[PDB]
Design an enzyme around this catalytic site. Structure first.
Site, PDB file in Angstrom:
ATOM      1  N   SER A 159       0.817  -1.220   0.000  1.00  0.00           N
ATOM      2  CA  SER A 159       0.000   0.000   0.000  1.00  0.00           C
ATOM      3  C   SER A 159       0.853   1.274   0.000  1.00  0.00           C
ATOM      4  O   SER A 159       0.609   2.179  -0.804  1.00  0.00           O
ATOM      5  CB  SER A 159      -0.949   0.013   1.201  1.00  0.00           C
ATOM      6  OG  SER A 159      -0.228  -0.071   2.417  1.00  0.00           O
ATOM      7  N   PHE A 160       1.842   1.327   0.895  1.00  0.00           N
ATOM      8  CA  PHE A 160       2.731   2.491   1.048  1.00  0.00           C
ATOM      9  C   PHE A 160       4.204   2.205   0.687  1.00  0.00           C
ATOM     10  O   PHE A 160       5.105   2.922   1.136  1.00  0.00           O
ATOM     11  CB  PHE A 160       2.625   3.031   2.483  1.00  0.00           C
ATOM     12  CG  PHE A 160       1.304   3.679   2.792  1.00  0.00           C
ATOM     13  CD1 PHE A 160       1.041   4.982   2.375  1.00  0.00           C
ATOM     14  CD2 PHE A 160       0.322   2.995   3.507  1.00  0.00           C
ATOM     15  CE1 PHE A 160      -0.176   5.589   2.657  1.00  0.00           C
ATOM     16  CE2 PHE A 160      -0.897   3.597   3.793  1.00  0.00           C
ATOM     17  CZ  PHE A 160      -1.146   4.895   3.367  1.00  0.00           C
ATOM     18  N   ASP A 166      -8.394  -3.532   4.626  1.00  0.00           N
ATOM     19  CA  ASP A 166      -8.225  -3.766   3.190  1.00  0.00           C
ATOM     20  C   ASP A 166      -8.082  -5.276   2.921  1.00  0.00           C
ATOM     21  O   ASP A 166      -7.123  -5.728   2.290  1.00  0.00           O
ATOM     22  CB  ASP A 166      -7.021  -2.970   2.654  1.00  0.00           C
ATOM     23  CG  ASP A 166      -7.024  -2.823   1.131  1.00  0.00           C
ATOM     24  OD1 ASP A 166      -7.976  -3.276   0.453  1.00  0.00           O
ATOM     25  OD2 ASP A 166      -6.055  -2.235   0.607  1.00  0.00           O
ATOM     26  N   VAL A 170       7.782  -4.140  -1.997  1.00  0.00           N
ATOM     27  CA  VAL A 170       8.232  -5.243  -1.144  1.00  0.00           C
ATOM     28  C   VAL A 170       9.343  -6.031  -1.836  1.00  0.00           C
ATOM     29  O   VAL A 170       9.200  -6.422  -2.997  1.00  0.00           O
ATOM     30  CB  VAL A 170       7.068  -6.194  -0.802  1.00  0.00           C
ATOM     31  CG1 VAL A 170       7.542  -7.323   0.102  1.00  0.00           C
ATOM     32  CG2 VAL A 170       5.937  -5.421  -0.138  1.00  0.00           C
TER      33      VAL A 170
END
Ligand SMILES: CNc1nc(-c2c[nH]c3ncncc23)ncc1F
Length: 312
Positions: free
Chosen positions: A55-56, A160, A59
């Protein structure tokens, strides 16, 4: 400095980060600091091939230079860092949540270290398989709800819940929730909220009403419909934005495939009640899903079977 320790030290240190040189807490023997430091490309190294997008932040597969152990690392900027990222997954007892290995700040970014699950996401599995057979869908929804049940019991709302935020093991047997960037704390109801995936949003969030744990339950049944149909709820019938439709239309129970068993259809209905007071909790929906899985015959379908065509 960067020390080894336990979850409470990391969470209180996470509050100071979210409030705004090299500091943090490593919660596992695999990742080890050197001289109370832990720096990118010095004590641990990133792999070139990316794991995915959170999301932010992106990875990456990482690797500690001393020990040689690999883990997942999500780099989140301090300007968008939320303490709930770590508080949602630090020192949790449940195996249905991806465990936190540590969190370390290095200048303007926070590096969140998490356990690797090598099977990919549930979203990637649905994209590859087209859609999942009923017993496979129920099986993963069951394990997702075990995770949610545990989170809700610890005053944590995922915020989410979707196939992309459910990682699988190599053999498909174990599933776990990831990505706690939308995570919110619950008081004896919600607080400040960051919006998740529009197609999975409960009516209460779109109406601007007060929200609670039941939002994740709605989203989990949207994820169930996605698994069964190969496409998100709403999108076959309406074009975006969906917020006025989610508020006004009936819940998308019409997208339940007619092949589904009575208990499966009934379970999806109770999870997709518009009024959250009429809607079952995670623990209650988990019970219905386990019983429905037993009705259909248990987990029989093969791990990565044939391609089932999505609905058009
Ligand atoms: C891509 N989005 C995310 N992924 C993971 C994650 C942890 N461990 C993993 N292992 C293998 N793939 C992915 C992961 N965590 C948080 C996220 F926002």
């Amino acid at each position: 400095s960067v020390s080894s320790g336990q979850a409470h030290s990391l969470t209180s240190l996470a509050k100071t980060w979210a409030a705004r040189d090299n500091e943090g807490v490593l919660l596992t023997e695999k990742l080890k600091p050197v001289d109370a430091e832990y720096r990118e490309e010095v004590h641990w190294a990133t792999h070139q091939l990316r794991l995915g997008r959170g999301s932010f932040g992106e990875v990456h597969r990482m690797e500690d230079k001393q020990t040689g152990f690999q883990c997942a690392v999500k780099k989140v900027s301090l300007e968008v860092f939320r303490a709930e990222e770590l508080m949602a997954c630090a020192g949790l007892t449940s195996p249905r949540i991806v465990p936190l290995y540590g969190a370390v700040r290095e200048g303007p970014a926070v590096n969140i270290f998490m356990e690797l699950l090598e099977g990919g996401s549930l979203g990637q599995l649905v994209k590859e398989q087209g859609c999942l057979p009923e017993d496979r869908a129920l099986y993963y929804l069951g394990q997702a709800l075990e995770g949610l049940e545990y989170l809700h019991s610890r005053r944590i709302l995922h915020g989410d819940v979707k196939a992309d935020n459910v990682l699988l093991s190599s053999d498909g047997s174990h599933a776990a929730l990831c990505d706690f960037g939308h995570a919110v704390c619950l008081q004896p109801l919600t607080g400040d909220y960051i919006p998740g995936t529009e197609t999975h949003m409960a009516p209460e969030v779109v109406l601007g009403r007060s929200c609670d744990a039941k939002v994740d339950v709605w989203s989990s049944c949207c994820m169930m419909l996605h698994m069964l149909n190969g496409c998100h709820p709403w999108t076959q019938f309406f074009r975006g934005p969906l917020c006025l439709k989610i508020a006004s239309e009936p819940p998308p129970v019409r997208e339940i495939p007619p092949s589904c068993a009575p208990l499966t259809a009934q379970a999806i209905q109770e999870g997709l009640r518009k009024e959250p007071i009429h809607r079952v909790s995670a623990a209650e929906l988990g019970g219905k899903v386990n019983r429905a899985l037993q009705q259909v015959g248990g987990l029989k379908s093969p791990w990565r079977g044939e391609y089932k065509e999505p609905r058009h």
